[PDB]
Design a protein around this nucleic acid. Structure first.
Ligand SMILES: [Mg+2]
Ligand SMILES: [Mg+2]
Lengths: 48, 49, 97, 231, 157, 94, 227
DNA sequence: GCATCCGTGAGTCGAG
């Protein structure tokens, strides 16, 4: 089976930040740069 | 249960010295260890999500 | 940025608002040109960000950049389970685990 | 002291990119006009994508073809990026045929031409075929809107066909710029600029127009008020 | 906390002024910051409190909407027959509590207006609301504080 | 929170008594097919479906609302059990 | 792939001329906030209304001065003047100057303003000032048609040397609050439900207010027509 | 009264 990413899957970085994807937003909802480039992931600062 | 597969990184006729990469293993990109994706992140709270 | 200036686009009004905010935050040195302050922010690793739902900028500059993230093997597709009724144990006559 | 209909400027490069300026506008209307269009442009603009693939001697997506370097997963990954323009407005579906062999690099050009169908990116790589390596494909491209995953549509022309994830939206990127302008003694007026990048399947301007039409048609939905029976 | 905190600025730096017009002129020249503490007529105040005076919350937040002043600026607003020196943000918080519990007087009593909201103050708020208005209205208050808390935490930067 | 829960906690000397009251009442309503309800048609709890509004199938909701209307009598040793059963059967067949 | 969409049903819930709720469901994904935000901006900023721009009071030099014989200071009266809701019956009329003269032990309400042609005072019971024995109030207020919110320091208009500029609140709309809730039609759970809430001063009704708002937006969509 | 010996305890769901 070919598994895409879905709500409930676990992501983590190498520095010990770990979390579950809680929301998949459509591209238009995503915070973007002035040139129109959207971001893939929104991390919470409170975790740092 | 993860799928372990190798993929060829070279092409017909290519000259290769000793130790050059031929096939890319699982979780490997051009001989470098690949455990995930490089994504563009923004660090801000978002609507309690 | 320099590309953007060459493309014939000056500073956005939203970028002005955000720059006022960052100026109040002591992030950028007051009196500089908008380009200078945007460079000052970008150097601190922060950029101006627009909320996609509104179009209005996030009041502050936000830290944005490429990060390496992995998908761990704990996957919801494996873990989700529910039962109404099902098999029962031999001696205890209780539901199996 | 009432602003009126602003000048509308249009800049274009190819069928790919475009800039659309509206000036002068009342304060804040740069965003009021600019952002909704962006949202509609990025999502609801109809387009084309490959909805299915059949290769001969290939039962499923997980298999490798002899003589072919790329695995079927990668071949379909490459097929995802194929840009297929329909000249006919009435044409809902097209099946592209590819037949190739011998040492060669099979590109998008190698598809057998169909009437009122044009490949906007002929240089797109598909496969690398070795000596004796033989590739035969039938791909199905459809008209659709938004992003419909292969799991959702499950479109198959035949038994061994492989359903493919389809991104229909021709719009690659949308940005909008609000700059300070003035008319007469008025100040702090908005000058709006919509920058649009597409795949060439449809031009930026077409997209902008049908997106506007979408916004208007949605504004239509307020025209028939109705009493709340909650009480 | 981000909406309920007030700005403290260093530009004005405690200058003395005879008449308010002098202060307004001074700020206009860029000599004195909006939120910087100063003494007009011998009693301490800020330029912001003099310059902008709102007849009601709706007007104030309307001004915040048009970019006249921010939620963190100290200003003067008329609320419930009282003349208040406070931020529009705090007026907003107060109106959130009030709308949530559907009692304006009680709400006005529960809140501590002149301090920025945090874990302890909000805890005390939840408890007092429990006691006075009961668990249903307290649950509604909770949901509200959740909503606005998140919504504002987002755009806070 | 359950609507008017504070009033319900006011009505009884112990919260668990409220619980028992509501549960028993709900069982009565289920058994008698809601015919025995003390609620007027306009006071009927409504579930909003695809077609339109309908009667709320949930017995507990009903019982709590009925209880809120003060149209119910709750207490110990009101009437002998079989008598209550037979009478409720008489007025409302099942 | 093949898509079906039903035209949403517009739901209206109104209490008097002061308020209304507006529910539009179902909507396609993301279109909740797509219509929602623009209408909010347009409603608050651009909807035509009337405000008190300038006020002159006899024997009063500036804004923070006090009026002998009256309890409220000048500032408190200016505030009360900000809440005055004035309606122009004639579309031709751009501006009015309302005069008021009173004295003695009387509490001046908005009724006391001398009537003007095609000018309706929506809130005649509104409190302006209270006067004691020996107190006198002579004032003229300048009411202009406009849009949104203009601070006093921004227009700076004076008919007289002693006339005081007032922050002008033109917007008949007091507040706009909108929220998008996930609702479902059949199989799909994400479909958008737009709930809109609008406050007004009574001069223009919320339904009228929203209809004006969607008109302004729609007209702007026609500005993409001719290059 | 005080050293010494023998038996009985030592977190929860999950997968295994
Ligand atoms: Mg003022
Ligand atoms: Mg208090």
């Amino acid at each position: 089976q070919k598994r895409k990413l879905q709500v409930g899957d676990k992501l983590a970085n190498r520095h010990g930040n770990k979390g579950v994807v809680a929301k998949i937003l459509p591209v238009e909802d995503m915070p973007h740069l002035p040139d129109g480039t959207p971001v893939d992931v929104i991390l919470n600062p409170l975790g740092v | 249960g993860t799928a372990l597969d190798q993929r060829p990184r070279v092409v017909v006729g290519q000259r290769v010295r000793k130790g050059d990469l031929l096939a890319d293993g699982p979780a490997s990109e051009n001989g470098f260890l690949a455990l995930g994706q490089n994504v563009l992140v923004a660090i801000m709270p978002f609507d309690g999500y | 940025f320099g590309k953007r200036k060459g493309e014939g686009f000056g500073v956005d009004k939203r970028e002005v608002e955000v720059l006022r905010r960052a100026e109040k935050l002591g992030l950028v040195t007051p009196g500089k040109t908008p380009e200078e302050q945007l460079k000052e922010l970008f150097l601190q690793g922060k950029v101006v960000l627009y909320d996609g739902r509104t179009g209005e900028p996030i009041e502050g500059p936000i830290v944005v950049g490429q990060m390496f993230i992995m998908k761990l093997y704990h996957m919801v597709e494996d873990k989700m389970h529910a039962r109404s009724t099902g098999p029962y144990s031999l001696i205890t006559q209780q539901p199996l685990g | 002291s009432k602003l009126k209909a602003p000048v509308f400027t249009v800049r274009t490069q190819g069928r790919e990119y475009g800039e659309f300026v509206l000036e002068p506008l009342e304060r804040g209307f740069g965003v009021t006009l600019g952002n909704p269009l962006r949202r509609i442009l990025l999502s609801s603009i109809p387009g084309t994508a490959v909805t299915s693939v059949y290769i001969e001697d290939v039962l499923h997506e997980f298999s490798t073809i002899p003589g072919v370097k790329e695995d079927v997963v990668e071949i379909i990954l490459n097929l995802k990026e194929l840009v297929v323009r329909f000249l006919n407005p009435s044409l809902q579906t097209v099946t592209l045929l590819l037949k190739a062999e011998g040492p060669k690099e099979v590109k998008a050009r190698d598809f057998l031409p169909v009437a009122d169908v044009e490949i906007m990116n002929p240089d797109l790589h598909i496969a690398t075929l070795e000596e004796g390596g033989r590739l035969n494909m039938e791909v199905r491209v459809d008209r659709g809107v938004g992003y419909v995953p292969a799991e959702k549509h499950g479109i198959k022309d035949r038994i061994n066909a492989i359903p493919v994830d389809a991104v229909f939206s021709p719009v690659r990127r949308v940005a909008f710029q609000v700059e300070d302008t003035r008319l007469g003694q008025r100040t702090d007026l908005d000058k709006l600029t919509l920058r649009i990048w597409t795949d060439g399947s449809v031009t930026p301007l077409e997209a902008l127009n049908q997106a506007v039409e979408i916004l208007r048609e949605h504004l239509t939905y307020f025209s028939n008020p109705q009493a709340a029976a909650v009480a | 906390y981000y909406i309920t905190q007030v700005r403290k600025e260093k530009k004005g730096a405690g200058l003395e002024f005879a008449t308010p017009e002098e202060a307004l002129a001074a700020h206009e020249r860029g000599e004195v910051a909006l939120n910087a503490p100063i003494k007009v007529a011998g009693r301490e105040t800020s330029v912001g409190r003099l310059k902008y005076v709102f007849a009601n919350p709706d007007e104030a937040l309307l001004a915040v909407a048009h970019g006249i002043v921010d939620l963190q600026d100290v200003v003067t607003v008329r609320y419930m027959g009282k003349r208040l020196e406070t931020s529009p943000g705090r007026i907003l918080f107060a109106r959130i509590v009030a709308e949530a519990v559907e009692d304006e007087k009680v709400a006005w009593e529960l809140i501590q207006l002149d301090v920025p909201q945090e874990k302890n103050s909000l805890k005390d708020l939840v408890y007092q609301a429990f006691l006075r208005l009961g668990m249903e209205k307290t649950a509604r208050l909770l949901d509200a504080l959740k909503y606005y808390g998140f919504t504002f935490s987002t755009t806070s930067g | 929170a359950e609507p008017g829960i504070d009033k319900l906690f006011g009505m009884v000397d112990s919260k668990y008594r409220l619980t028992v009251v509501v549960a028993k009442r709900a069982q009565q309503l289920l058994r008698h097919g809601f015919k025995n309800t003390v609620l007027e048609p306009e006071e009927r709890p409504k579930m909003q479906t695809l077609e339109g509004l309908f009667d709320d199938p949930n017995a507990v909701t009903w019982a709590m609302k009925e209880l809120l209307t003060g149209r119910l009598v709750f207490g110990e040793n009101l009437v002998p059990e079989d008598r209550l059963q037979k009478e409720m059967e008489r007025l409302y067949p099942v």
